[PDB]
Amino acid sequence: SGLRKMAQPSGVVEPCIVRVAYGNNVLNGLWLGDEVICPRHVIASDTSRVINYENELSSVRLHNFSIAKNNVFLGVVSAKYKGVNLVLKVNQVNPNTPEHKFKSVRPGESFNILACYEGCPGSVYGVNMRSQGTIKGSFIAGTCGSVGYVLENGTLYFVYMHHLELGNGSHVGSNLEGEMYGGYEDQPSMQLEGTNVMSSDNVVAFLYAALINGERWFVTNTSMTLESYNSWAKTNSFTEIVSTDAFNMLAAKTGYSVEKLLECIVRLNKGFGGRTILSYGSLCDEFTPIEVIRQMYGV
Amino acid sequence: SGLRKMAQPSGVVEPCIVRVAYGNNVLNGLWLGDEVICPRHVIASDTSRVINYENELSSVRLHNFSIAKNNVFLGVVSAKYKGVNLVLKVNQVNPNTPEHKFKSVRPGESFNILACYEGCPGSVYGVNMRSQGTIKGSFIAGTCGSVGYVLENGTLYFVYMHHLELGNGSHVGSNLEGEMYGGYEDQPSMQLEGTNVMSSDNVVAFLYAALINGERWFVTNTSMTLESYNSWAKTNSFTEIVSTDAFNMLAAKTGYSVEKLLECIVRLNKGFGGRTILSYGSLCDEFTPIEVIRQMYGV
Ligand SMILES: *[C@@H](O)[C@H](C[C@@H]1CCNC1=O)NC(=O)[C@H](CC(C)C)NC(=O)OCc1ccccc1
Ligand SMILES: *[C@@H](O)[C@H](C[C@@H]1CCNC1=O)NC(=O)[C@H](CC(C)C)NC(=O)OCc1ccccc1
């Protein structure tokens, strides 16, 4: 089997992607109702030097937007900022607007990326939000405005819109309220990412996935109290676990308690000593308990 | 940027997925026009024992079929085998039939999986055909009939439908004409997968991907002739590389010849020294050259 990232199906999102162009900039927007949301730097005169967003908005030429998807062309009625996004009122309502909500993801939470190029959906893949508000994706020029979404209990949530890449290659975006994850600015200046704190919950999930896949060299009958692991995590840039509850099913199927896997984390946090788990050379925190449960058992 | 296995968007496929139930079996089918294609073992009395497909077909009663797509009830008009698939003529035309073709994938080629459960699309992810005609596909019970597809040259091709899992965990399916990849039978019987042979072309692509992403610890200026590499590969379960032409753009952009990366391959197959390469602990052959070119540079 193995453990691989998957994405939820993208069909309900694709009809919402449009191409937004202004001046020499082209990126993607999200068309819902009679509004299109896109990163505000599309109206920046020059995206390599610092941008004065007040000047850009007050001087904006609504008729100088080009917004299109296939046989649809959209006129801009009015424009405003909401955080780091432009909210553009347009003169047509999207006939394929799905029921949807907006919410923010938190560190350790997984979601899907619909990566789009110049208004055209190209690829769909799963990611996971890190403590500093970055994701490791695969964005290149033309993919700003790409959208992250999650389906929960049949509800479509929009959670991410892509804005920029940091000097170290990490990817940064906003929620659909225009709040940038991790507090970064939509400027080219160059910005630092601090140290990410690993999701302990997701690492446990990972080890359970390994066990289900038959690998067991890393496990023993020694256990380490939550209560004690949390004291360690703390000072080792690992999150601390509130309860063992999310794992009860996975413990049942495997026969191994959480407390036994906490020992593994503390022994292996430096590395595998030339060994591997699900082909990775070190601990992976990009898979949630629910992600793993669903991939191994279809729940 | 980085290297993620990506899937092409699934929207054009999702309206084609239907639930197919018969006897004690529930799986997925592909509804195109007035036809539903699904694995023929859906009519098997007992899928845990050897199946006589002639007896099962003579015993079929069309009213025991239940086929559904949301609120649509698809009545079965007639049934026949085509290879290892059932082709069911149904009493309604799919109004969302996309323009499409059928084609077979070959070892080393990438394509997308839309994994479906009880007729409901669940996940989408990219895979790559292995030398023995298998994929590592994350399939579990209830996912038979899941579809593989690729969007290439402006057309949607259906290339895979899921049938079974081998004793070693590999997954086996057919093309949509009903020929099982790798010559496997649609029986619960035990079937052997020979040795997996890695696509050398895809491994070079992968290492170029690493170079483009700034990872360079494994490379040196020592090179190895194409002829020497193929002589090595013949006895080390790697394919032989016909010529270096497909990599010219990647060679130009990185400054490294294929012949240097060939030497790299021969050195890293003995082990990584506990190191990692785009986070993998061993060589990965799941990305084609054009897949890598397009993810890193677009167009
Ligand atoms: C989309 O407009 C674009 C996506 C970047 C480009 C390369 N990989 C990405 O994620 N965003 C920008 O170009 C962005 C706009 C600023 C005004 C915030 N600037 C940016 O990301 O610069 C950093 C960078 C540019 C090009 C390659 C590598 C890093
Ligand atoms: C879909 O009907 C199912 C998908 C299998 C189930 C487990 N993982 C998959 O991909 N296919 C079968 O159950 C198939 C039935 C025909 C061969 C008659 N048999 C099969 O795959 O048996 C091997 C196996 C069964 C259950 C768990 C693990 C391996």
Residue numbers in the entry:
A (entry chain A), B (entry chain B): 1 to 299
Manuscript text:
Coronaviruses take over the host's transcriptional machinery by encoding two overlapping polyproteins, pp1a and pp1ab, which are cleaved by coronavirus-encoded proteases—papain-like protease (PLpro) and main protease (Mpro, also called 3CLpro) —forming 16 nonstructural proteins (nsps) that are essential for viral replication. Mpro, a cysteine protease, cleaves the polyproteins at 11 conserved sites containing the Leu-Gln↓(Ser, Ala, Gly) sequence, releasing the nsps required for the viral replicase complex. Since Mpro cleavage is required for subsequent viral replication and transcription, Mpro is an attractive target for drug development against coronaviruses. GC376, a dipeptidyl aldehyde bisulfite adduct, is a prodrug that converts into the active-form aldehyde, GC373, upon administration, effectively binding the active site of Mpro and stopping viral replication.
Here, we present crystal structures of FIPV Mpro-GC373/GC376 complexes, revealing the inhibitors covalently bound to Cys144 in the active site, similar to SARS-CoV-2 Mpro. GC376 being the dipeptidyl aldehyde bisulfite adduct form of the drug converts into the active-form aldehyde GC373, thus making both structures identical. In both structures, FIPV Mpro crystallized as a dimer, with each protomer being comprised of three domains, similar to other viral Mpro. The active site of FIPV Mpro contains a Cys144–His41 catalytic dyad located in a cleft between domain I and domain II. In both structures, a covalent bond between Cys144 and the aldehyde of the feline drug reveals that the bisulfite leaving group indeed was removed upon binding. Weak H-bonding was observed between the oxyanion of the inhibitor and His41, the general base in the catalytic dyad, which is distinct from SARS-CoV-2. For the P1 position of the inhibitor, the Nγ of the lactam ring sits in the S1 pocket and forms a H-bond with the carbonyl oxygen of Phe139, a conserved feature in other Mpro structures with GC373. The S2 pocket that supports hydrophobic interactions of a Leu moiety is formed with His41, Ile51, and Leu164. In FIPV Mpro, Ser1 of the N-terminal finger from protomer B forms a weak H-bond (3.8 Å) with the cyclic glutamine analog nitrogen of GC373 in the active site of protomer A, however, this is not seen in SARS-CoV-2 Mpro. While structures of SARS-CoV-2 Mpro co-crystallized with GC376 solved by other groups have shown the drug binding in both R and S hemithioacetal isomer conformations, here we only see the R conformation of the drug bound to FIPV Mpro.
